Design a protein around this ligand. Structure first.
Ligand SMILES: Cc1cc2nc3c(=O)[nH]c(=O)nc-3n(C[C@H](O)[C@H](O)[C@H](O)COP(=O)(O)O)c2cc1C
Ligand SMILES: Cc1cc2nc3c(=O)[nH]c(=O)nc-3n(C[C@H](O)[C@H](O)[C@H](O)COP(=O)(O)O)c2cc1C
Ligand SMILES: O=C(O)c1ccc([N+](=O)[O-])cc1
Ligand SMILES: O=C(O)c1ccc([N+](=O)[O-])cc1
Lengths: 216, 216
């Protein structure tokens, strides 16, 4: 039951470095990243999946100093996922999305692809010409992916914690993201919690439905 | 299997208006909205859940005219969820969150409570004061909730579709959201698809892992 998963998943504060994901679980978490929905199927994202000791150490550099309370989570987890968003939405990216949709068989004619290209253009240029908030629009799609991801890994029986407490300028420079057209937004260590995870035994806390929900 | 869910769920293009959620399902989708994670457990959100015909008609006003292609989806679904973000992070909301955490038993001393409140204020001030982007920061948490929600309702065997194609100004006015301190971001009709949901039999399409993932 997915509600049981939602009530039992929690943000892990400490990971057991000896408990690694299986090869099968490693493939499943990449499938989760890939198949998240996004506005107009824009998929405006890139993921760094660090599983070697050196790779995780490179990610953990972003937690040095002020964010040190997040550094050990990145070092001790089995896999660490860096969620990145595109910095600008270009036509080339939109062309590759619609061509992939054709390759996967979503169009029955060279007509319907011209209409899907016509549609995704009017939508994206609204954020590039007019609103000029396509940077924030793409980052929102990445946060949607994070929310999909956290529930999915919980359903797999894996522990995780989402992290905003890191230096994105440091992380971007370490992986050369800016020149690639990406910027890091959220880091998610994935693995199994240790006995030092004090948050595993604390009750969950949320505002009541009478506050957050209006029915009509 | 949650991966089967991720590969099976789709954006429904048309809903069967005769098929309603059960009472138990209606409670479960509210639990999903409630228990989504968020940065510092800030829960900067409110949800309109329209299930009556008059309520759904009120939400559907935001799809009239320019966004007419989304209007029937709102009218036909069993339940329509409006995801709303706070427009500003005020100190009273932060106090409300920490008071709820105390009521739920997450602190063992009053000093533990004040320390948690001090930390949440510090990180909120990073967005309110330094970055001056708390409005975008809170919207990102709401998008994370949507991503959690879409996978959860798919795991319940329910159809849904996320919608950005609506007039948020019209929707905010219809429900007085701006004066209440909120703004609408995403509309999600939930129910069961009809024969007119052409997307139900199309294959899913995503960019390949060679493009979106870097392993290290
Ligand atoms: C986007 C985001 C960023 C977060 N950043 C951190 C973080 O930097 N360090 C941390 O320990 N927890 C972080 N959290 C975890 C939250 O404190 C946690 O999700 C919230 O208190 C709800 O608890 P739960 O995840 O156990 O349900 C973050 C959560 C989200 C969604
Ligand atoms: C934030 C968001 C907004 C979307 N807005 C619309 C919309 O307004 N109308 C619509 O029919 N589909 C909308 N979609 C659906 C996307 O086109 C769809 O998620 C994407 O093509 C991937 O396909 P899937 O959801 O079937 O996996 C939206 C999706 C997201 C995540
Ligand atoms: O108007 C829009 O913002 C809009 C966004 C997404 C989609 N879509 O994903 O089909 C359509 C319209
Ligand atoms: O952005 C941060 O530094 C940050 C730190 C802690 C948390 N948190 O504990 O949820 C969230 C964000």
């Amino acid at each position: 039951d997915i509600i049981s998963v939602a009530l039992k998943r929690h943000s892990t504060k400490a990971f057991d470095a000896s408990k690694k994901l299986t090869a099968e679980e490693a493939e499943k978490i990449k499938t989760l990243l890939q198949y998240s929905p996004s506005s107009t199927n824009s998929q405006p994202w890139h993921f760094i999946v660090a599983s070697t000791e050196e790779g995780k150490a490179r990610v953990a550099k972003s937690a040095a100093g002020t964010y040190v309370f997040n550094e050990r989570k990145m070092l001790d987890a089995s896999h660490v996922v860096v969620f990145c968003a595109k910095t600008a939405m270009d036509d080339a990216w939109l062309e590759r999305v619609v061509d992939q949709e054709e390759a996967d068989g979503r169009f029955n004619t060279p007509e319907a692809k011209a209409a899907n290209h016509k549609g995704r253009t009017y939508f994206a240029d609204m954020h590039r010409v007019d609103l000029k908030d396509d940077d924030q629009w793409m980052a929102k799609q990445v946060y949607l992916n994070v929310g999909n991801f956290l529930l999915g890994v919980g359903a797999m029986g894996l522990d995780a914690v989402p992290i905003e407490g890191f230096d994105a300028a440091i992380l971007d420079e370490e992986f050369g993201l800016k020149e690639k057209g990406f910027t890091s937004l959220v880091v998610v260590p994935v693995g199994h919690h240790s006995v030092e995870d004090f948050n595993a035994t604390l009750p969950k806390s949320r505002l009541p439905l009478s506050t957050i929900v209006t029915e009509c």
